[PDB]
Structure 1
Amino acid sequence: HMEPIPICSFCLGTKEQNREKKPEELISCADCGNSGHPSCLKFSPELTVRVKALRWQCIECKTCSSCRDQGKNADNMLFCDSCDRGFHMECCDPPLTRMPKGMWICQICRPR
């Protein structure tokens, strides 16, 4: 993993200062080192704990966990609400006819 950048990309704060100027540990991208406070990333406490256990990729580094295509910058993917892994629409299982309004949970989190 790339050496983590010790500040949050969104608020500039270190682990000592989130947006409320309170201490909060950073989540860091394994590929580029970009970091964010979970609160700045808008991750729930449950998502935060899971992501800290995984090799997390930031929004720019994220590749599809099914096909792992390098892809193009213009491509889109869903982000799992339980683990934050990314999946192309065409790579989701079960297949989706449309984007869910609420939470979406990937096939790694809930095999089905």
Structure 2
Amino acid sequence: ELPHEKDKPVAEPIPICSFCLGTKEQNREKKPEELISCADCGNSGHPSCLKFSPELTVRVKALRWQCIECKTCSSCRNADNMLFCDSCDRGFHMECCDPPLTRMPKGMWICQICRPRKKG
């Protein structure tokens, strides 16, 4: 976790999925599933509705996660030219990546935090 994530207020979570309108007891298949909630605005989603894998779900539950609208660059601190890490869902401007990106990767992308550059 980044320092500026470890100390800040966490908004009250809204106990409904913004996607399916169900509670923790009813996802899209009407089965129970704990919500993930934005620490800034409190908006929630079922991990299944957010299309997160279980591994990502587990990682994000451990972090101060921001929803799509609240998301801020973890480098410079939304537009359409943000990248979201497929490991932690943090946002980074392409020009804020290390090294900087100029085109959308075809496949997966991971940030420096989840996989620091090989300093040999």
Deviation at 1:95, TM superposition (A): 2.1
Q: Which residue of 2 aligns with 1:78?
A: 83
**d(CA) in 1 for partners of 2:54, 2:99:** 26
Greater displacement, 76-85 / 95-104? 95-104
Q: C-alpha deviations, 1:44-82, integer Å up to 9, x for none? A: 1111100000000000000000000xxxx5353100000
Deviation at 1:98, TM superposition (A): 1.6
**d(CA) in 2 for partners of 1:97, 1:58:** 24
Contact 1:80 1:86 in 2 (8 A): yes
Contact 1:10 1:36 in 2 (8 A): yes
TM-score by length of 1: 0.90
Instruction: Report the number of matched residues.
Output: 106
What is the RMSD of the two structures over their aligned residues, measured on CA atoms? 1.1
Contact 1:27 1:36 in 2 (8 A): yes
**d(CA) in 2 for partners of 1:74, 1:83:** 19
TM-score by length of 2: 0.85
Contact 2:20 2:27 in 1 (8 A): yes
**d(CA) in 2 for partners of 1:34, 1:97:** 31
Contact 1:94 1:107 in 2 (8 A): no
Contact 1:64 1:86 in 2 (8 A): yes
**d(CA) in 1 for partners of 2:101, 2:38:** 28
The secondary structure found in structure 2 opposite 1:40 is: coil
- Runs of 5+ consecutive residues of structure 2 not aligned to the other structure: 1-11
Q: C-alpha deviations, 1:21-50, integer Å up to 9, x for none? A: 000000000000000000000111111100
**d(CA) in 1 for partners of 2:103, 2:81:** 14
Deviation at 1:94, TM superposition (A): 2.4
